[PDB]
Amino acid sequence: RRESWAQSRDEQNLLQQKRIWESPLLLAAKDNDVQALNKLLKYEDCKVHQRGAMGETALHIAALYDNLEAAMVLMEAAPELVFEPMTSELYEGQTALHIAVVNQNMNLVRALLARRASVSARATGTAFRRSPCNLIYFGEHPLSFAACVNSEEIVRLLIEHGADIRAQDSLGNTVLHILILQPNKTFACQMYNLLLSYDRHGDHLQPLDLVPNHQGLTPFKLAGVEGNTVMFQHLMQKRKHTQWTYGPLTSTLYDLTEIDSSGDEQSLLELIITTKKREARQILDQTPVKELVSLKWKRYGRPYFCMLGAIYLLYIICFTMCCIYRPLKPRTNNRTSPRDNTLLQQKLLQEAYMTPKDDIRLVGELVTVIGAIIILLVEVPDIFRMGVTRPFHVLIITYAFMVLVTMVMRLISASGEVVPMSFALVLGWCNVMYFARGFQMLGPFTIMIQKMIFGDLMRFCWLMAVVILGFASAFYIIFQTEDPEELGHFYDYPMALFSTFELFLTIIDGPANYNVDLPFMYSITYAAFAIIATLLMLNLLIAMMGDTHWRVAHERDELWRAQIVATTVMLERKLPRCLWPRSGICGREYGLGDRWFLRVEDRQD
Amino acid sequence: RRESWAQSRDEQNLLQQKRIWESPLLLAAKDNDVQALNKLLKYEDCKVHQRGAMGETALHIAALYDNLEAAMVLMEAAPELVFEPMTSELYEGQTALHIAVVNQNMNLVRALLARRASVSARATGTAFRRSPCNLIYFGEHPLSFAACVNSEEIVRLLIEHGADIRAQDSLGNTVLHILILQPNKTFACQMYNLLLSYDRHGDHLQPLDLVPNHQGLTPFKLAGVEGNTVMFQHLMQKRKHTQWTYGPLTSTLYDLTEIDSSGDEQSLLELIITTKKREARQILDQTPVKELVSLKWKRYGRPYFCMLGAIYLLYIICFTMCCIYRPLKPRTNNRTSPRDNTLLQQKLLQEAYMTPKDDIRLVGELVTVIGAIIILLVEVPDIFRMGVTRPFHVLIITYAFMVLVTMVMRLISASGEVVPMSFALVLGWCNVMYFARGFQMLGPFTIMIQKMIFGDLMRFCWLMAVVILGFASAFYIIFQTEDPEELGHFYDYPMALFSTFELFLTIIDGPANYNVDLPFMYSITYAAFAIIATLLMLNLLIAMMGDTHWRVAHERDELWRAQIVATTVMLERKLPRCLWPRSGICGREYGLGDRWFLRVEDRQD
């Protein structure tokens, strides 16, 4: 199932080595063999256009095994074999110019250009596309191939012979975008300068560092999403304008145009926080950005997050107050058939709103219903307007349904409404833990409780729900032939599981009676449940929750700053303008244009 | 709100760059432009006194962007432009001599001194004052500016031209005080020697290392408060007088005048322990001081701290003894209206002191009242005599009120006095934890209990008082329609919070009855409270109290020595002389003057 692509790849690469061993022409191109390559091309031609296992000529082989002399003898006998690409599906459109560039063969690339090779050869195969299957993402063009391998010789050689500097691949990446997607980040900085040096701006469109992809990303914005910090410090030096320097002081000044959210729908700060990478959050510490989100939060962002956290805390007190005064008449019927098993003595009211203390509650209930529709008007026209659904969004909409269920369940006088009022008194209060991110020291406590549930408890609840089902289905059998008035823990099977879950966690004690003879098999089975499940499997979980606290408190300040960017972006697109002005100091009154700058000085030495 | 100071700073620094771009004269001073600076000053003058955005001439710009030749052409056309300072509020009083010194421009400072520049220019701006807003604290004078940048050339150059070595800024700091407030501490040691070398003592007042500030600190005492250890080892070598050396032995001898508390109101040991810095306690390990407070404590300081801890331990036993024998007659009235809810059967006496076993208690009560006025006579005329109130002071005055409340509450025969007797039996005993600092190994256990309450429990009680209010207001609703004779934990709402606080910490068990049918929603809600709140949020707090024990026991001996200095200073000003003599061996009988020395020998090699 969807794994034969790596199986057919390995059969095709072995099919290449079979046809390279059958033909005497092509076996005389692996190891050069100029004595026989003369003699084979002397016979008549012996089929100079022999296609191998993957669409290849005899000149592709001599360029691939780095045979300079075997191609010089071949090109003098080749009428047009520089022109033909490979005609495969795996390696499609790869001319012989591509192969001679990647191997840094400087003498062969001078040869193929001399016989008029096309430098715009679209190598549109499937072994060159951006994929986790392919270990290389070089591009499509020989200028793109020469840039990724860090060869400063062929790059000068191809531009002189007319290579296009603005060519794009299938993913729309210009030749400066692929250099950001390379592992050797230091060598990609020099190639970023050398390729942009061949940009004579002749009233063409945007000058090669602003050309977007099919997604819309510039090379600056692509270096932010991909977590490329070395190609971010180097690309920022075009944008800072250093003012006066005064001994050790240096009053630099950053441009801040593609970083801050303009009238354009996206910004750099929105792309960093919503991407699926982890190294992209490392770029949120650099000197243009760290002084931006800590200036956008100290002013304009903390007072709008505490006013939004004091209305909600005076809302969920208004909901708790109008819910512990719920109606509750004294009874209707007699004590039903179970003798003393059924203790319940209220059976809440039907439809009486008299007695004016209930009219005070009616004002306190309509606030909690209006307050639960406004949640469904700023959350439901977000997901059903953007489509994708990527987690306190889902704990504030679930609260918003459980109030709206209770309204429908009361107007029709349905009976049991203590169940929607128990998913709203605990989902409603435990969302005040969301507002513990405007405080730095209370911030990543919400991170630890996520990584202890979904990372250390969902991985060890499957080895605890097996021991608990093992010993509760053994405790039930032992106390199945007993009298469940004394020692009545395990009286039926749904209670045997709940009263073994509690004995696991050591919250209830552990049963004994001392006035009766407990069955013999209980004293052995419980003395093996106190060992395998109380001190040895519970105290393995508490140790797993003691190095998830450690590896989060070790990076306390980095997890908080990613909670401030994600809050400020959420609070900027919803809360409108004239209450949230642009950050920084504008141009247009200091002779700088329509750009929004942000200066900062730092003592260096 | 009080953040426009950094906003008006950034607009003013951009207003400088606008007026530097409008004037052809001043734009010909950034990049020197000697072709046009000749042509502009040839026209007529074209306003040689043009003030820019911040009070500046055209010569300030040529000194700020390090333009030597643009000022040489300008000063020959400048009639008096060396004289005028900046006339701003930000950069006020800064002449052009200040700017040429900071940039280490040696050729320009020779020029401005040749045209008779004043070297006593009070640069009394607001961008030079000591503040966390300003990244530099250089001073006011060009001799003060040359000392901070570590230039040994201009410092010789200014003293030859008559710079005052004893000048003071607005904060009273002489030129040796600012060198202690510099980050490069190694380079500030050489400048301390070179500036003090120009001190020919000519029957002037105290020789430049004893001149106080407006606070009263000498440069030696300022190096103690500011935590500057490198400027403390270097400044101590003036004070030690080395005696005989005998192979590896070396019997050095320290001066100990500005360290130990003289008749002067302050000492070095009082300033270290009462300042708001943390690096100031690092200086309390150096060789003059560490052998002082460990000689002031082994004798004279431990026997006066254990006699003061055995009177108090025989006082709080006298208070416990006279409080569990409190009067308690057998009743007055009947069992009041609640059936068996009100179990109480004493209702303490009014005013009977007969039956001579009560006359023994009266002697035991007057000791506990006299003992609680003496606390209010050595503590209340301290805070209301010094004004500022900066924490076992507040747990010994709170004990002193709760005894004095109980005296007033008994003489008027008021009813409920079990509440002031319960803030005095627990505040009174838990102050014997104060006297666990005369013991080295019991010492910083009092530090750990502070940093676990005010540092790890006041930060995580706000994420626990939300879950506890969430589940107690859900447990109350479920057991609101029940019979609270069986399973009567949550019978009213103040008890639902207390019986969920206890279920959180796992001190009471967890309710069950097994003879009745508990409601269905309880078995789900409690099985989610045992997970989110017993093993996952409690065992996150216990891990937070396991790396606060670690980071205090790692520095066990440093926290104890700061508890001995703070005890010895407190016990020296209250307990008078003739019971606490001066430490060290005096002069005046060995030909050394009126100084109090302390010798120590150490094997070196």
Ligand SMILES: CC(C)CCC[C@@H](C)[C@H]1CC[C@H]2[C@@H]3CC=C4C[C@@H](OC(=O)CCC(=O)O)CC[C@]4(C)[C@H]3CC[C@]12C
């Ligand atoms: C009748 C009166 C009482 C009206 C009551 C309205 C408020 C109690 C509600 C209405 C809309 C709610 C907001 C709707 C959306 C959000 C975003 C939501 O953010 C997330 O889910 C996470 C995003 C992030 O991590 O930044 C958190 C709750 C919050 C602020 C809600 C807080 C409480 C609000 C203001």
Ligand SMILES: CC(C)CCC[C@@H](C)[C@H]1CC[C@H]2[C@@H]3CC=C4C[C@@H](OC(=O)CCC(=O)O)CC[C@]4(C)[C@H]3CC[C@]12C
């Ligand atoms: C921290 C570790 C132990 C997590 C492991 C998860 C499970 C082992 C626990 C967590 C939730 C528990 C359940 C939560 C609630 C109930 C309902 C309880 O009784 C009922 O309310 C249903 C009976 C009825 O139908 O009336 C029976 C046990 C059961 C299934 C519990 C069985 C054990 C469960 C699956």
Ligand SMILES: CC(C)CCC[C@@H](C)[C@H]1CC[C@H]2[C@@H]3CC=C4C[C@@H](OC(=O)CCC(=O)O)CC[C@]4(C)[C@H]3CC[C@]12C
């Ligand atoms: C009738 C008889 C029993 C008189 C009883 C008097 C003592 C029981 C009281 C009176 C004054 C009290 C003292 C008043 C002041 C202080 C300083 C106080 O120091 C601090 O608060 C912290 C200072 C530091 O950290 O060094 C600690 C308690 C102590 C020694 C008190 C110890 C107990 C004393 C001697």
Ligand SMILES: CC(C)CCC[C@@H](C)[C@H]1CC[C@H]2[C@@H]3CC=C4C[C@@H](OC(=O)CCC(=O)O)CC[C@]4(C)[C@H]3CC[C@]12C
């Ligand atoms: C009747 C009920 C409400 C009991 C009330 C008890 C609290 C009011 C008391 C009991 C124990 C006290 C604590 C005991 C010990 C310390 C350590 C103490 O730490 C230091 O003083 C260390 C610094 C130093 O070296 O002086 C600070 C006060 C504190 C937290 C105390 C704070 C107040 C507490 C919690």
Ligand SMILES: CC(C)CCC[C@@H](C)[C@H]1CC[C@H]2[C@@H]3CC=C4C[C@@H](OC(=O)CCC(=O)O)CC[C@]4(C)[C@H]3CC[C@]12C
């Ligand atoms: C270690 C963690 C859990 C600290 C978190 C702090 C709070 C969650 C705790 C600490 C003190 C507790 C309070 C201490 C004492 C009381 C009084 C108690 O009943 C009373 O005495 C008042 C009722 C009446 O008026 O008669 C009700 C619970 C309450 C408020 C407790 C509720 C829970 C509190 C606020």
Ligand SMILES: CC(C)CCC[C@@H](C)[C@H]1CC[C@H]2[C@@H]3CC=C4C[C@@H](OC(=O)CCC(=O)O)CC[C@]4(C)[C@H]3CC[C@]12C
């Ligand atoms: C009636 C019974 C079933 C009670 C049901 C309780 C649960 C449905 C609730 C109560 C507390 C909740 C948790 C409270 C806090 C968090 C942390 C929260 O973490 C973050 O959002 C961190 C990331 C960020 O910074 O936004 C994720 C949800 C989670 C696990 C919640 C998941 C759902 C929980 C377990």
Ligand SMILES: [Ca+2]
């Ligand atoms: Ca128990």
